[model samples]
Target: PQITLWKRPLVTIKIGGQLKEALLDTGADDTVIEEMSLPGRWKPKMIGGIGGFIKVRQYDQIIIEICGHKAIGTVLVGPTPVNIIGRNLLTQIGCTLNF
Candidate 1:
């Protein structure tokens, strides 16, 4: 038998009663969750982006499962079409990007 290792970590996040798989990104300054798919309790907040200030929301505590590990942390909900696993999450797991 042979074993294989992954170069990147895969994490599972619960959103609106659904589980989603996302790739970890250490370069991201903040956690970005799917905009339209977030739970109703998450409050919306204005954040600055490259284009200008954008409306973003904050989650009280998100349950994240990565590499057989589980943790609860604050998350920023965004309207990004794609999910982004950011620095806040990486730091909690003590992971740093080399590049």
Candidate 2:
């Protein structure tokens, strides 16, 4: 499916057995999810976004399903504007950016 980058790529994803909308952001280096409850021992960490740096919880080996494709990887929990699936997890789902 060929598409343009003028609009953000938004898709339905399943995390922790729940459905949610997320963006496939190629510019992002890590996956950031909205703050929520999940079974895990996350460590406190900070990351820099376009706006500024913010603290977030880092959870490892979390399973996420993007458009029917599933992948287990690290996920960051924070107060992000929206859910973002970065290249790290995106690669596992075989997502490629093309013109």
Candidate 3:
């Protein structure tokens, strides 16, 4: 499927029976979500942004479904302001950009 970039490019994705609104962030390297009862035992790691750094729990093998496409990938649970669908997960979907 082809998608013209929207102003925000926000989409709803379901992961592990939970629904979340996520932004399509091509600039990001990893998918990030606000920590909300997501269960896992993770080693501590830090991710950096213009706002500085955030501590995250890395979870592998998370299933995410977006617009009929499904993928199993890593998700970072942290103090993010919003859920972000980054290149790590977005690349699995059919849409690709062109200049």
TM-score per candidate: 0.62, 0.92, 0.88
Ranking by TM-score: 2, 3, 1
Q: Write the per-residue lDDT of candidate 3 for residues 1-99, one digit (tens) a residue.
A: 555775678888998788889988888999998876655666677998898899988988888997668987888988989899888898888556776
- TM-score for model 2? 0.92
Q: Against the true structure, whose TM-score is highest?
A: 2
lDDT of 1 at 96: 54
- Name the runs in model 1 displaced over 4 angstroms: 1-17, 36-41, 51-53
Cα RMSD (angstroms) for every candidate in the order listed: 4.8, 1.3, 1.6
Per-residue CA lDDT of model 2 for 1-99, tens digit only, reads 454777888989999878989999888899999987777899998988668988889999999989889899999999888999998899998888764
Candidate 3: worst-modelled 10 consecutive residues by lDDT: 36-45
Taking the tens digit of each residue's C-alpha lDDT, what string does model 1 give over 23-54?
67655677777654544477777766566666
Please give the clash total of every predicted structure, in order.
0, 0, 0
Q: Report the error of model 3 at residue 19, Å.
A: 0.9
Identify the runs in model 2 with alpha carbons over 4 angstroms from their true place: none
> How far off is model 3, as Cα RMSD?
1.6
Best by lDDT: 2
Segments in model 3 whose C-alpha atoms lie over 4 Å from true places = none
